[PDB]
Amino acid sequence: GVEPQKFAEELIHRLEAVQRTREAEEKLEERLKRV
Amino acid sequence: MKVSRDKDGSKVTTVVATPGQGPDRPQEVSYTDTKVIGNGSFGVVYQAKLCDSGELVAIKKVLQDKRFKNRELQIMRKLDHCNIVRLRYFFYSSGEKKDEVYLNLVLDYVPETVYRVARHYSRAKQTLPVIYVKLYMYQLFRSLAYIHSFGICHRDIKPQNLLLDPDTAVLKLCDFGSAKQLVRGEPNVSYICSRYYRAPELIFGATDYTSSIDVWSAGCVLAELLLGQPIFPGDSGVDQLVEIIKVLGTPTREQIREMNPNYTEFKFPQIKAHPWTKVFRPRTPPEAIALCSRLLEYTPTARLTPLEACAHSFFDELRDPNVKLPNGRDTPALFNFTTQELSSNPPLATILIPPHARH
Ligand SMILES: Nc1ncnc2c1ncn2[C@@H]1O[C@H](COP(=O)(O)OP(=O)(O)O)[C@@H](O)[C@H]1O
Ligand SMILES: [Cl-]
Ligand SMILES: [Cl-]
Ligand SMILES: [Cl-]
Ligand SMILES: [Cl-]
Ligand SMILES: [Cl-]
Ligand SMILES: [Cl-]
Ligand SMILES: [Cl-]
Ligand SMILES: [Mg+2]
Numbered sequence A: 001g002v003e004p005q006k007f008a009e010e011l012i013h014r015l016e017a018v019q020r021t022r023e024a025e026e027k028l029e030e031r032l033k034r035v
Numbered sequence B: 001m002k003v004s005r006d007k008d009g010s011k012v013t014t015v016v017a018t019p020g021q022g023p024d025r026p027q028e029v030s031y032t033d034t035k036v037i038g039n040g041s042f043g044v045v046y047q048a049k050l051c052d053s054g055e056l057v058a059i060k061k062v063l064q065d066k067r068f069k070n071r072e073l074q075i076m077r078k079l080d081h082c083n084i085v086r087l088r089y090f091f092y093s094s095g096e097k098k099d100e101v102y103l104n105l106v107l108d109y110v111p112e113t114v115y116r117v118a119r120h121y122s123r124a125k126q127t128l129p130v131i132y133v134k135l136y137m138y139q140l141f142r143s144l145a146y147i148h149s150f151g152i153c154h155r156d157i158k159p160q161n162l163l164l165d166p167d168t169a170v171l172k173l174c175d176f177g178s179a180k181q182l183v184r185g186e187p188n189v190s191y192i193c194s195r196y197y198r199a200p201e202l203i204f205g206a207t208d209y210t211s212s213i214d215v216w217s218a219g220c221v222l223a224e225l226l227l228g229q230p231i232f233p234g235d236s237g238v239d240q241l242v243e244i245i246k247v248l249g250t251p252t253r254e255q256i257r258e259m260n261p262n263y264t265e266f267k268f269p270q271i272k273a274h275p276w277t278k279v280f281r282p283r284t285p286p287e288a289i290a291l292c293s294r295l296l297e298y299t300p301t302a303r304l305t306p307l308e309a310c311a312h313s314f315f316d317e318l319r320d321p322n323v324k325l326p327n328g329r330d331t332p333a334l335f336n337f338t339t340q341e342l343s344s345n346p347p348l349a350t351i352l353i354p355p356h357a358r359h
Helices: A004-033 B072-078 B114-123 B130-149 B212-227 B237-248 B253-259 B286-295 B306-310 B313-319 B346-352
Strands: B002-005 B011-019 B027-040 B043-050 B056-063 B087-094 B101-108 B162-165 B170-173
Touching (some): A004 B237, B027 B056, B027 B087, B072 B101, B114 B162, B130 B162, B130 B170, B130 B306, B212 B306
Antiparallel strands (some): B002 B011, B043 B056, B056 B101, B087 B101, B162 B170
């Protein structure tokens, strides 16, 4: 909906958040297995 | 609306109503034993008992508004299909407040929904047996093939809108309150359909979408039946698209173009998809997963049509002449296709109608 330029920015920002969460998830696995 | 008390002391409601189908000639309709069966922001659903026949009916009471823009009565008068709930009568009534006008849809009563039965199995930490998943999905795709042949798109396909008789395994699509006859070149509102079941091109704001948004919704329903919960549980409209992308991966530029060409130039982050075999439980039947992968496509024209879906190999067991319900009784009507129903792909009848049912 709304302006495509606005909606695309919000979607990009949220998808970047997904990438950061997934990357932090694997780093947490490595930290836990190191313990 | 007059009221009387019969023997057994029940409250009897008598109205003048118009038949849902056939000639426009009003008739007295009397019912009793009314109780609230469902709810909405703009109305109430009741169960009642017709006085002459004793049959249970449902009465959907919907508040009328000038800006409401509800095509529900007009669509329901036109529909006649074994997998769609039949309109027996309709009449208008007034509420307790001034200028409070209600449309009353007297429908055939069906005791359960796919949502309630699925939730019941889910709460018992169990999955619905696959034969019922085939039966429910097949009848849904059958009803979508019917309405789509008129250009009519339901736009709110979800488990709550799938009526269900558990004794017979008959499914009946209901709740045409969002339904519209889509006309090519005439735009349609993109904020439509319940969030968990909303096609991605709608979330992208496409107004030129087609009846394939229902096939995406059916895919969500099938996935939910296999999973035990909704597959795409978005917290909001944009989050719903994020939940979709978390499973299917980021749509390609060509898929974005097919959903909404205004977004083809944007470089979105590439989210790695979950493999289809990891989305569901290990013992989920592989044909159910395969069929689901052909419904939950980004590109709307790549989704199976409802007639093609009915012909998918996941439903082969339904076409077996030995197939019967687990309780013992035989399956409901499955192969009595009409010319209207088959109009999208008339040659497919040789696959949809097996020789034993041609007889
Ligand atoms: N013909 C019917 N027979 C029995 N129950 C019904 C019938 N129609 C609707 N209901 C019940 O009432 C609920 C609300 O009706 P429906 O028209 O589907 O949606 P809404 O809540 O938008 O009106 C449905 O989910 C279903 O549980
Ligand atoms: Cl803002
Ligand atoms: Cl762990
Ligand atoms: Cl609901
Ligand atoms: Cl058209
Ligand atoms: Cl191009
Ligand atoms: Cl990237
Ligand atoms: Cl896809
Ligand atoms: Mg509904």
